[PDB]
C-alpha cells in the first residue's frame, strides 16, 4: 500500500477460483466456484445467512445447499453470478480494494470475443480496476513451465489437451481436444459405486465421491492384467468412512475410474484415449521436430496427478513410437497450480507491463482492445 | 591484426556461403544461404529469436522456419537479404572487422554488369571495405585446379558446364550450359520417393531428402542392366531412419535419381546428358587440340562426387571417341570446395595484388571499375 | 442381357463410389465410401442389421454408426473393406452379375504399382470379371472434358491439381499438388463454428457441417473487403436448422471457410493458394504455349462448384498475367461427375476396346499387365 | 492438266523448302524444313496427330515439338527424312501428281556426286517423275539476277559467299566461303539476350529470337560510334512482347547481333568480315576486270535484307579501294527468293528443255548422268 | 670461341628459316617462319607465354595461335617481325653472340635493292655483326649442286623455276617463272578434300593437310590412265588419322593434288606446266648447247621430292625432244636443303672471304655496298 503495484491474478476455474498476488509462489485464495442457497429454505427464527455464497461455506455446509457453476464447463455463462464470484474474490478472500490493483484474468480456450469483452466491461465498470489483462489459461500454464519445446499433455477438470510446442509456439493445428477430464471421472465413479448397491446421487454425495477419487483411485500398469488380479485382490478392497459414518469398501473401482482416460469408451466416448491423441498430435507435426517432442512430453493439470501416470505414458508411447526413439515423460510436481503460476509470472512481468490493458484503452476502443492485438 | 593483410574470400553460393581468409586451405565458414523466420509465429512469452537468420540455426531449427535463397539460382536477386548474409558472414561467422580486409567476392557466370556494380557499392558503402575484387566462380575453380589444358566437367548445385581449356583460356564458344545439377536431383528424389506412398514435400522434408541423396545414391555401371538387376536386388533396399523415427526403404531410387545427369529426359529436360555435352564441346574445338582434351577431362563440383562417376565417364567417352584416342578422366578429391580454393589462391596473390579494386577506384569510376577492364 | 457388352465403370472415390454402365450419361449408383457398425452395439432382442455396410444406410443412420474410409485419401488401404465396397456396388447397388461385364476401375494419382496389381487380382479372382481396365481418375476427367489444350484447375474432395495440357498431354513437370480440398474445408468449418460456442465434433456433426458448407458457403469478391462488410452485414447471418431442431446462425463463416483455397495459411498450409499454383504451373511451360493456357483455364471437381469462383479466378489471374494477355475461365456445369463421365467415355469406347485387360492377360503376365504398357 | 508441261521447281533449303511451278513469279509453297514429333508424347485419349511433319504445323505447334533439319547445313544427310519432305511438298503443299511433272531440284555448293545421285534415284524410283534436273542454288540465283558481270555478296541462312562474275562465269578461284550467316546470327542473339538475365535456350525460344532478329535488328553506320551512343540511347530500348506475354526490352543487341557479319570475331570466327572478303575476292581477279566488279557489287540472300547494308558496304568498299574507283552496290528488292526465281527461270526454259534429265538417261547411265556433263 | 671464324648462314625461307654454321653439312636450326599470338587470348591466371614466337612452339601449339609470314611469298615485308625472327635465330635456336660471327643471309629472286639495304642495316645496327653477305638463294643452291652445265628444274615452296646453265652462268633470258609450288599444292589439297564433305579451312587444318600431302600424295605415270584406274582402285583409299582421332580416307586426291605441277589449269593457272617450261627454256638457248641441257636436267627443291617425278620428267621430255636426243634427269637426294648447303659452301669459303661485306663498307657506302658490285 504505496506506489509500485502488483497484478491481481484471478484464474476463473470451472470448479475452483484460484486468486492471489502476482509474484506469490501459489494462489492465496482457492474456493469452489458455485452458487447455492437453501434448496428447501424453511424460514426459522432469524437470518444471518448469505444467499448464494457457495465459495467455502457451501462445502462445509453440504446437504443444505444447491450448487451452480456459472463457469461450469470453463466458459462464463452467467454474468450476475460471475459478478458475485469476483466480489467475493476481491472483498472476502483477498480483502483488497480492486481500484488499487491491475488485474490479470484468465479465460478458457475458445472463449468468444464478446465474452472477453463482457469480462473487461465488468472489471472496469463494476470494480473500477485501474487496468486489467486477460490471459489464456493454457498459455499461462505453458508460461509457468518454462519449456520452449516439447509436447504437453494437460488434463485438468473439464478438458484434456495435447499441445505440441516448438520454440514457444503452439502449432495450432496439432492440438487435439478431449471433453473428458476430472469432472467426468467423478461422475463415472458415482455411477460405478452405485453398481455395488451403494447410492451416490446427491450434490453432497458427489463431493464425497470426488474425495474417494482423489484419495484412493490409481492407474493400472496394465488394465487387462489388473482386472485379472482383481479376483484374488486382497489389496484393492480399501475401506472409506462416509460422513454418515457407514464404511464402504472400494476395490476395482479404484482403477476402473481413471482407466477412462486411456479408454474413453468406458463413458461412451468415441474419442481416442490420451496416448492415442499424443501420437496423433506428434504425427500432425513435421517429422523433423518429432524427436524433440518425444523427448519432452510434459504432463500438466490436476488429472495428471495420479501416481503411476508417467510410467504408464512412457510404456504406451514406447509401444507406438519407432524403436530407436528416445522417449521422456516429465511431470512437474505441483502441476495443478500450473495455470495460476503462469498467470502470476505474466502478471508480475514488469518488463512486459505494457501488455496490461488500461482504463484509457477500454474507453477508447472499448473492451475489445484486450482482445484485438493483445490479451 | 597488424600490417600486411589478407583477402576476404567470400564465395556467394546458391545454397551455401563459403567464406574465410586468403591463404587458408579451405573456408572456415560454410552456412546455408537462406532467409527464414517463423512461418506461423504464434508469439508466446518473450522473444530472443532472430528474425530471418537462416544460416546454420535454420537447419537445426527445421520445421519452424521458412527459407528463401536471395541467390536461389546463383544470381543475387534481393539486396536487402544479401546485406544480411554478408553481415552474418563478417560479424557472426568470421568475426572480423571488414574495414580491415580487402575482400574478394565471387559471382555466377553471366552475372549482369549492374549486379556486379551493386555488389561493389554495398561492399564499399555498407561494409567500408578498404578494397575488393569480384571473381568468376568457375574461374576460381579453374584456378584452384592448376591445369592449363583439358576439358572440365563442372557439376555443382544449380548448373553443370563443360569447359574446354587450352593454355588457360576458356574458349567461350565451346562451353555448353545445363540447367540441371544437385538442386534438381534433390527435387527429383523427393518426387520419386513420393511414388512409393511416402510424402516428402515440406521444407524440412526437402532437407531430409538431400541427406538421403548425399548418403545413399550412386550412379550405375549401366542404367538398363541396373534396372534389370533391381528385380532380384537384395542390396538396393537400404534403410534410412527419418527424424520422426520411422524407417523408409530405398532401392532403385538410389540410382534412378543421379541417372538424370546422363538422361535429362527423366526430369523433362530435352538437353543432352553430360557425356553428350562433353563430346559436343570437344567437337566445337579444333581437331588438333582434341587429343589434349580427351586425355585431360577434369571433374569438378559437388555433383561430381558420386563414387563410380569417373569410371562411367571413361566408358561413355570411350564409346563416342575414335578407337585410338587416349582418354583420361581426372577427379580431384575434394572438388566441391574447388571454387573457394581458387578464390583463396587469387585473393592471396600478393604478386597480382594490383588486381584488387580499391575505394579510390570505386569513387573515381564508381563500382563499374571492378567490371570494366578487370574483375 | 445378350451379346455385346457394356463396361462396368466404377470410380472408387475417397468419400463416394460412383458406378454405372458405360454409355450412361451419369453414374446410376453414388454411395458413401465408408465402413461402420454400431460403435456401442448393445444387443437388444433380435438382429437384422448389416455389420459395416455404411453405403447409404449409414448416413440416414447417423449417430448410431462409426465410419471408415478404406480409400480415405484416395488410395485403397484395406483390401477386405474394399472387397465389401465392390460387392455392395455390384450386387446391391447395380444389381449385376460381374462375370458378365468388362469393368473399368479408376485409381488415384500416384497409386503404387502393387496397389493396381491387387485391385486387378480381386477383380479377376474374387468377382470373376471377364476383363477389366484401370484408369487414372484425373485422366478420365480430362477425357470427359474434350479439350486438348488449356490449363485445368481440378479441385475435388482430398486434392487439388493444376494441370497444363497441350495437345492432350499432361506435361508432367508442370502439374503441382495441393493437399487441401473439400475434406479440409469441412473440417475447418467444424472448427470455426466451434469458435462461436457451438460444438461440432462427432461423426454425425461432421455430416451436418458438410451440409452447411455445401448449402451456404461462398467465395468472396475480395477477402479483405468482405471482412470489412461483415460488421454491418445483415445478409450474412443466415439461419440453419440442426437435426435436433435448434437453429444456428452462420455469418462470416460462409466465406471464411472457402477462403482457405486462396489462403492455405488459414489451415496452416504453407502451400500457395490456387491462383498462385495456376501461375506457377503456366510458368513451368514454354512461354510460347502460355497464351493458349491463359485462354483455356478449365475448372473441374466438386470444390470448384462455388458460385463466384470463375469470376474470382478471372480477376486474380488478370492481376498476375501480362496486361495484353487474353484470359478465359471455363467451368463445365456438372463438373463433379467429370471423373465418372470420362471413365464412361473410355470404357464405352468400342473403338479402343482392345485396351481393356483380360483374364488371359492376367493369367499370363499376372495383374501387372494392366499396369505395364497400358492401364 | 493437258499436254505441255511445267517444271517442278523445288529449292531444298537448310531451313525452308521453297517450291512451286516454273513460270510463277515466286514459290507457292514455303515451309520449314524440319522433323519433329512430340518430345514428351504422353498418350492421351485418341490420336490424329502426324508424327514428324514439322512443315508449317510445327511452328504453330511450338513447345510440343522437336525439330530436325535433314538439310541442316545445306547438304541432305538423312534420306528417309528427305523422302518425307518431298512427299509433303508434292502431295500436301503443291497437291500435284509428281509423275506428271519434270522436276528441277536445287543442291548446295560442294554437294557430293553420290548425294546428287541419291537425290536422282529417289525422284525417279520413289516419286516416278518423268524427268528431273538438279541445279546449283547459287547458280539459280545468279540466273535470276540477270547480270553477267559484277561481284555478288550472297548472304543467306547457313553460308555467305563473295562471287566475282565476268561474262557469266564464276571464276572459281576468286570465290571465298564464310560459315557465318543467319543461323549463326539467331544463335548469337539468343546468347547475348541471355546476358541481360533473360533465358532463350529452347527450340521455341529460338523461334522467338529469330522473330526478334528479323523485326528489330539493324546494322550500324559505324560500330564504334553506335556503341558510344548506346549510353544516351533512348531509341534503342524497343519493347517486344513474348508469347507468354512478358515484355522484354532490346537495345544495343539490335545492332550487336548483325555486327558479326563485319566482325566474325564476335562469335569466335577468325574469318575476315564480308567487306574484307569482297576486297580479297576482287584482288584474286585480273586488275583489268576490277573496275567492272567495283561498279557491280550485287547483294543477295536473306541476310542481306537489313536496312542500311548497301550504304555501309558503299562506305567500307570506298575506304579500301583506290580513290578514283567508281563503286556501286546494287541490292535487288526481294533478294531472298532469288534462289527460287533462278530455278524457276531455268526450269521454265523451253529453249533449254533438253538439259532436263530423263527416266531413260537415269536407266542408261544411272543418276550420275544428272551430274556428269550436266546438272 | 677463339680466333678464326665461321659464317652465320641464315636462309630466310618463305615458310621455314634454315640456319647454322658454315662448314656444317646441313642447318642445325629449322623453324617455321611465322608470327602468332593467341587469337582469342582470354587472360586466365598468370602469364608465361611468348607473344608471337611462332617458330616451333606454334606448330605444337596448333589451334591456339594465329600465323603470319613476314616472308610470305619469299620477300621480307615486315621489318619488325623479321627482327623478331632473326633474334630468335641467333639467341634461341643457335645460341650465338652475333657480334662474333660474319653472317651470310639469303634473299629471294627479284628482291628490291632497298630491301637488301634494309636487311644489311638491321644486321649491322641491330645485331652488330662484324660482317655479312647477302646471297641469292637460287644461286646458293646452284652452288651446292656443283654442276656447271645443265638445266635445273627447281620447285620449292612458293615458286618454281627452269634455269639453263652453261659454264656456271644463268642465262637470264632463258629462265621462266611459275607462281605455283608447294604452298599452292597444300591449299589445293585442302579444297579438294573439302569436296568429299570434309572441312579443312583453319590454320590448324592447313597444317594437317600439309602433312597428308607430304606423306601420301604422289605423281601419276599418266594422269588420264590413273583417273581411269581410280574406279577399281582399292589401293588409293589410304586412311589418315586426324589429331581429333577421326580417320579420313584419301584416294584420287593423292595424285590429283601434285598433277597441278603438270597441269596448272587445275588451280586456274594459265601457265604452262613444268615440262612445257623446261622445253620452252631450252628453246630460248642456242641450239648448240641444247644437247648439254637435255642430258643434264637437275631437279631441286622440296616440291621435286615426290617419288616418280624423275621418271615422269624423262617420259615427258622424251616425248617433246628430237628422237635422237639423249635425255637424263638427275635428282639429288636431299634436294630441299640444297639452298642452305649452297649458302654454307659460299659462306665457308675462306678463299673468297673477301666477298663478305664489312662494318667499314656499310659505314662508307652504306648497306647498298652489299648490293652494288657484289652480294
Ligand atoms: N491429486 C489428484 N489426483 C487426481 N485428480 C486430482 C488431484 N488433484 C486434483 N485433481 C483433479 O483435477 C481436476 C482439477 O484440475 P485443474 O487442472 O485445476 O482443472 P481445470 O483447469 O480444467 O479447472 C479436478 O477434477 C480434481 O479432482
Ligand atoms: N558427396 C556428395 N555427393 C553428391 N552430391 C554432393 C556431394 N557433396 C555435395 N553434393 C552436392 O553438390 C551440390 C553443391 O555443389 P557445388 O559445387 O558447391 O554447387 P554450386 O557451386 O552450383 O553452388 C549440392 O547439390 C550438394 O547436395
Ligand atoms: N455444390 C458444391 N459446392 C461445394 N463443394 C461441393 C459441391 N458439390 C460437391 N462439393 C464437394 O466436392 C468434394 C467432392 O468433389 P470430387 O471432385 O468428387 O472429389 P474427389 O474426386 O477428390 O473425391 C466434396 O468435398 C464435396 O463436399
Ligand atoms: N528481312 C530479313 N532481315 C534479316 N534477315 C532476314 C530477313 N528475311 C530473311 N532473313 C534471314 O535470311 C536467312 C535465309 O536466307 P536464305 O537466302 O534463304 O538462306 P539459305 O539459302 O542459306 O537457306 C534466314 O536466316 C532468315 O532469318
Ligand atoms: N618429301 C616431300 N615431298 C613433297 N613436298 C615436300 C617434301 N618435303 C618438302 N616438301 C615441300 O617443299 C616445299 C618447301 O621446299 P623449299 O625448296 O624449301 O621451298 P622454298 O625454298 O620456296 O621455301 C614445302 O611446300 C614442302 O611441303
In the numeric block, the cell 458415482 is attached to A190
Instruction: Identify whether the C-beta of residue C62 lies closer than 8 Å to the C-beta of residue C44.
Output: no
In the numeric block, the cell 528489330 is attached to D216
Can you tell me the distance from the alpha carbon of A186 to that of A200, in angstroms, rounded to the nearest whole number? 11
Residues with Cβ within 8 Å of D176's Cβ and at least 6 positions away in sequence, in order, are: D161, D162, D277, D280, D281
CA–CA–CA angle B356, B359, B360 (5° rounding): 100
Can you tell me the distance from the alpha carbon of C359 to that of C371, in angstroms, rounded to the nearest whole number? 14
**Rounded to the nearest whole angstrom, what is the distance from the C-alpha of residue E148 to the centroid of ligand 5?**
24
Give me the DSSP letters along C324-372: T----EE--TT-TTHHHHHHHHHHT-STTGGGSEEHHHHHHSTTGGGTT
Backbone dihedral angles phi then psi of residue B29, each to the nearest 5 degrees: -125, 120
Can you tell me the distance from the alpha carbon of B317 to that of B325, in angstroms, rounded to the nearest whole number? 10
In the numeric block, the cell 578434300 is attached to E193
- DSSP conformation class of C265: G
Q: Which residues, listed in sequence order, are joined to residue B22 by a DSSP beta bridge?
A: none
Q: In the structure grid, which three cell numbers stand for residue E304, read together?
A: 621435286
Residues with Cβ within 8 Å of A34's Cβ and at least 6 positions away in sequence, in order, are: A15, A54, A55, A58, A67, A68, A69
Residue of A108, A176, A270 to mutate for C, most C C-beta atoms under 10 A: A270
Instruction: Identify whether the C-beta of residue C151 lies closer than 8 Å to the C-beta of residue C297.
Output: yes
First to last CA, chain C: 27
SS3 content of chain D, % helix, strand, coil (to 5): 40, 15, 45
Can you tell me the distance from the alpha carbon of C156 to that of C160, in angstroms, rounded to the nearest whole number? 6
| From E63, E241, E247, residue closest to B288, measured CB to CB | E63
Can you tell me the distance from the alpha carbon of B206 to that of B193, in angstroms, rounded to the nearest whole number? 11
Burial of residue E304 (number of CB atoms within 10 Å: 0-12, 13-18, 19+)? buried
First to last CA, chain D: 27
Can you tell me the distance from the alpha carbon of A131 to that of A124, in angstroms, rounded to the nearest whole number? 8
In the numeric block, the cell 532467409 is attached to B35
- Judging by DSSP bridges, how do beta strands C329-330 and C357-358 pair with one another? unpaired
Whats the size of chain A, residue-wise? 375
Residues with Cβ within 8 Å of A306's Cβ and at least 6 positions away in sequence, in order, are: A217, A218, A219, A258
Q: In the structure grid, which three cell numbers stand for residue E136, read together?
A: 641469292
Give the E-state strand segments of C131-212 in sequence order: 131-136, 150-155, 160-166, 169-170, 176-178
CB contact under 8 A, A110 and C202: no
CB contact under 8 A, B173 and D202: no
Whats the size of chain C, residue-wise? 375
Query: Which positions in chain E have a beta carbon within 8 angstroms of at least one beta carbon in chain D?
Result: 39-40, 66, 194-197, 201-203, 267-268
> Which residues does a chain break follow in chain D (C to N more than 2.5 Å)?
none
Q: In the structure grid, which three cell numbers stand for residue B191, read together?
A: 518426387
Can you tell me the distance from the alpha carbon of B342 to that of A136, in angstroms, rounded to the nearest whole number? 58
Pocket test for ligand 2, best of B19, B187, B254, B303 (most atoms within 8 A of CB): B303
Query: What atom in ligand 5 is closest to the CA of residue E337?
Result: 18
Can you tell me the distance from the alpha carbon of C100 to that of C97, in angstroms, rounded to the nearest whole number? 6
- Judging by DSSP bridges, how do beta strands C8-12 and C103-107 pair with one another? parallel
Radius of gyration of chain E (CA): 22
CA torsion A87-A90-A96-A101 (nearest 10°) is -100
Instruction: Identify whether the C-beta of residue E190 lies closer than 8 Å to the C-beta of residue E201.
Output: yes
Question: All domains of chain D, ordered by start, with CATH?
Answer: 4-34+71-134+337-371 (3.30.420.40), 35-68 (2.30.36.70), 136-181+271-332 (3.30.420.40), 182-267 (3.90.640.10)
Can you tell me the distance from the alpha carbon of C43 to that of B265, in angstroms, rounded to the nearest whole number? 62
C63-99 in b/e burial notation, b at 16+ Cβ within 10 A?
ebbbbbbbbbebbbeeeebbebbbebbbeebbebebe
In the numeric block, the cell 655479312 is attached to E132
Give the E-state strand segments of chain D in sequence order: 8-12, 16-21, 29-32, 103-107, 131-136, 150-155, 160-166, 169-170, 176-178, 238-241, 247-250, 297-300, 329-330, 357-358
Instruction: Identify whether the C-beta of residue E294 lies closer than 8 Å to the C-beta of residue E283.
Output: no
**Touching B: which chains, 3+ CB pairs < 8 A?**
A, C, D, E
Tell me which residue of C277, C299, C298, C292 sits closest to C325, measured CA to CA: C292
Q: Is B358 helix (H, G, I), strand (E, B) or coil?
A: strand
Can you tell me the distance from the alpha carbon of E203 to that of E187, in angstroms, rounded to the nearest whole number? 11
Tell me which residue of C194, C138, C201 sits closest to C169, measured CA to CA: C138
Tell me which residue of A107, A171, A102, A113 sits closest to A136, measured CA to CA: A107
Instruction: Identify whether the C-beta of residue D274 lies closer than 8 Å to the C-beta of residue D127.
Output: no
Q: In the structure grid, which three cell numbers stand for residue A169, read together?
A: 509456439
Backbone dihedral region for residue D202 (phi beyond 0: left; psi -120 to 50: alpha; all else: beta): beta
Give me the DSSP letters along B235-296: SS-EEEE-TTS-EEEESTHHHHHHHTTT-GGGTT--SPPHHHHHHHHHTTS-GGGHHHHHT-
CB contact under 8 A, C321 and D42: no
Instruction: Identify whether the C-beta of residue C327 lies closer than 8 Å to the C-beta of residue D282.
Output: no
Q: Which residues, listed in sequence order, are joined to residue C105 by a DSSP beta bridge?
A: C10, C134
CB contact under 8 A, C324 and D241: yes
Q: In the structure grid, which three cell numbers stand for residue C152, read together?
A: 485445368
Whats the size of chain E, residue-wise? 375
The enclosing H or E element of E300 equals strand E297-300
Backbone dihedral angles phi then psi of residue A165, each to the nearest 5 degrees: -135, 125
Q: Which residues, listed in sequence order, are joined to residue A269 by a DSSP beta bridge?
A: none
Q: How many CB pairs under 8 A join A and C?
A: 17
Q: Is C222 helix (H, G, I), strand (E, B) or coil?
A: coil
Tell me which residue of C5, C12, C4, C23 sits closest to C101, measured CA to CA: C5
Q: Is D373 helix (H, G, I), strand (E, B) or coil?
A: coil
Q: Is B297 in the pocket of ligand 2 (CB under 6 A)?
A: no
Can you tell me the distance from the alpha carbon of A253 to that of B49, in angstroms, rounded to the nearest whole number? 50
Tell me which residue of B5, B6, B8 sits closest to B17, measured CA to CA: B8
Instruction: Identify whether the C-beta of residue C135 lies closer than 8 Å to the C-beta of residue C343.
Output: yes
CB neighbours of residue D211 within 10 Å:
14
Can you tell me the distance from the alpha carbon of E159 to that of E178, in angstroms, rounded to the nearest whole number? 6
Burial of residue D25 (number of CB atoms within 10 Å: 0-12, 13-18, 19+)? exposed
Q: In the structure grid, which three cell numbers stand for residue E171, read together?
A: 642465262
The enclosing H or E element of E32 equals strand E29-32
The enclosing H or E element of B59 equals helix B55-60
Burial of residue B240 (number of CB atoms within 10 Å: 0-12, 13-18, 19+)? middle
Can you tell me the distance from the alpha carbon of A281 to that of B65, in angstroms, rounded to the nearest whole number? 19
Can you tell me the distance from the alpha carbon of E150 to that of E163, in angstroms, rounded to the nearest whole number? 8
Q: Is E240 helix (H, G, I), strand (E, B) or coil?
A: strand
Sign of CA dihedral E40, E43, E44, E50: positive
Sign of CA dihedral C162, C165, C170, C172: negative
Give me the DSSP letters along B147-177: -SSEEEEEE-SS-EEEEEEETTEE-TTT-EE
Residue of E57, E58, E62, E63 to mutate for B, most B C-beta atoms under 10 A: E63
Cα B36 to Cα B77, B84, C268, D134, distances in angstroms: 16, 12, 17, 69
Instruction: Identify whether the C-beta of residue D175 lies closer than 8 Å to the C-beta of residue D164.
Output: yes
Query: What atom in ligand 5 is closest to the CA of residue E154?
Result: 17
Instruction: Identify whether the C-beta of residue E215 lies closer than 8 Å to the C-beta of residue E306.
Output: no
CB neighbours of residue C10 within 10 Å:
27
Can you tell me the distance from the alpha carbon of E91 to that of E86, in angstroms, rounded to the nearest whole number? 8
Alpha helix stretches (DSSP H) within E146-252: 182-194, 203-216, 223-230
Whose CA is closest to atom 13 on ligand 3? Answer: C157
In the numeric block, the cell 582418354 is attached to B327
Can you tell me the distance from the alpha carbon of A333 to that of A307, in angstroms, rounded to the nearest whole number? 11
Can you tell me the distance from the alpha carbon of D10 to that of D26, in angstroms, rounded to the nearest whole number? 12
Q: In the structure grid, which three cell numbers stand for residue B179, read together?
A: 540447367
Q: How far is CA C302 from the centre of its chain?
A: 6
Can you tell me the distance from the alpha carbon of D247 to that of D250, in angstroms, rounded to the nearest whole number? 10
Can you tell me the distance from the alpha carbon of D269 to that of B284, in angstroms, rounded to the nearest whole number? 12
Can you tell me the distance from the alpha carbon of D254 to that of D239, in angstroms, rounded to the nearest whole number? 11
How was it solved? Answer: cryo-EM
Q: Which residues, listed in sequence order, are joined to residue A186 by a DSSP beta bridge?
A: none
Query: What atom in ligand 5 is closest to the CA of residue E339?
Result: 21
SS3 content of chain E, % helix, strand, coil (to 5): 40, 15, 45
- DSSP conformation class of B65: B
Can you tell me the distance from the alpha carbon of C362 to that of C371, in angstroms, rounded to the nearest whole number? 11
Cα A166 to Cα A170, A286, A373, C265, C352, distances in angstroms: 7, 10, 22, 18, 56
B280-293 in b/e burial notation, b at 16+ Cβ within 10 A?
ebbeebbbbbbbbb
E144-169 in b/e burial notation, b at 16+ Cβ within 10 A?
bbeeebbbbbbbbbbbbbbbbbbeee
Backbone dihedral angles phi then psi of residue E44, each to the nearest 5 degrees: 140, -120
Q: Is E131 helix (H, G, I), strand (E, B) or coil?
A: strand
In the numeric block, the cell 537384395 is attached to B234
The enclosing H or E element of B106 equals strand B103-107
CA–CA–CA angle B193, B198, B203 (5° rounding): 80
Amino acid at each position: 500500500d504505496e506506489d509500485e503495484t502488483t497484478a491481481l491474478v484471478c484464474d476463473n476455474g470451472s470448479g475452483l477460483v484460484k486468486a492471489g498476488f502476482a509474484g506469490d509462489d501459489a494462489p492465496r485464495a482457492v474456493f469452489p466456484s458455485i452458487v447455492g442457497r437453501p434448496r428447501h429454505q424453511g424460514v426459522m427464527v432469524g437470518m444471518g445467512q448469505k444467499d448464494s455464497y457457495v465459495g467455502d461455506e457451501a462445502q462445509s455446509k453440504r446437504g443444505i445447499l444447491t450448487l451452480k457453476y456459472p463457469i461450469e464447463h470453463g466458459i462464463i455463462t452467467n454474468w450476475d453470478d460471475m459478478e458475485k464470484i469476483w466480489h467475493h474474490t476481491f472483498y472476502n478472500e483477498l480483502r483488497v480494494a480492486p481500484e488499487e490493483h491491475p488485474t490479470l484474468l484468465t479465460e478458457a480456450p475458445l472463449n468468444p470475443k464478446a465474452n472477453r469483452e463482457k469480462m473487461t466491461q465488468i472489471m472496469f465498470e463494476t470494480f473500477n480496476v485501474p487496468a486489467m489483462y486477460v490471459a489464456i489459461q493454457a498459455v499461462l500454464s505453458l508460461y509457468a513451465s518454462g519449456r520452449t519445446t516439447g509436447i504437453v499433455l494437460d488434463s485438468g477438470d473439464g478438458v484434456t489437451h495435447n499441445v505440441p510446442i516448438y520454440e514457444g509456439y503452439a502449432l495450432p493445428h496439432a492440438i487435439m481436444r478431449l471433453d473428458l477430464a476430472g469432472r467426468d471421472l467423478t461422475d463415472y465413479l458415482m455411477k460405478i459405486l452405485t453398481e455395488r448397491g451403494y447410492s451416490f446421487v446427491t450434490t453432497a454425495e458427489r463431493e464425497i465421491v470426488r474425495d474417494i477419487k482423489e484419495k484412493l483411485c490409481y492407474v493400472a500398469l496394465d488394465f487387462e492384467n489388473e482386472m485379472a488380479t482383481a479376483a484374488s485382490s486382497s489389496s484393492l478392497e480399501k475401506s472409506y468412512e462416509l460422513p454418515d459414518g457407514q464404511v464402504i469398501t472400494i476395490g476395482n473401482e479404484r482403477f476402473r475410474c481413471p482407466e477412462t482416460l486411456f479408454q474413453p469408451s468406458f463413458i461412451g466416448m468415441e474419442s481416442a484415449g490420451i496416448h492415442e491423441t499424443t501420437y496423433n498430435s506428434i504425427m500432425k507435426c513435421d517429422i523433423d521436430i518429432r524427436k524433440d517432442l518425444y523427448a519432452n512430453n510434459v504432463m500438466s493439470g490436476g488429472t495428471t496427478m495420479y501416481p503411476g501416470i508417467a510410467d504408464r505414458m512412457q510404456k504406451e508411447i514406447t509401444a507406438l513410437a519407432p524403436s530407436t526413439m528416445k522417449i521422456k515423460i516429465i511431470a512437474p510436481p505441483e502441476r495443478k497450480y500450473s495455470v495460476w503460476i503462469g498467470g502470476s509470472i505474466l502478471a508480475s512481468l514488469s518488463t512486459f507491463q505494457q501488455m496490461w490493458i488500461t482504463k484509457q484503452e477500454y474507453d477508447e476502443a472499448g473492451p475489445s482492445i484486450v482482445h484485438r492485438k493483445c490479451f
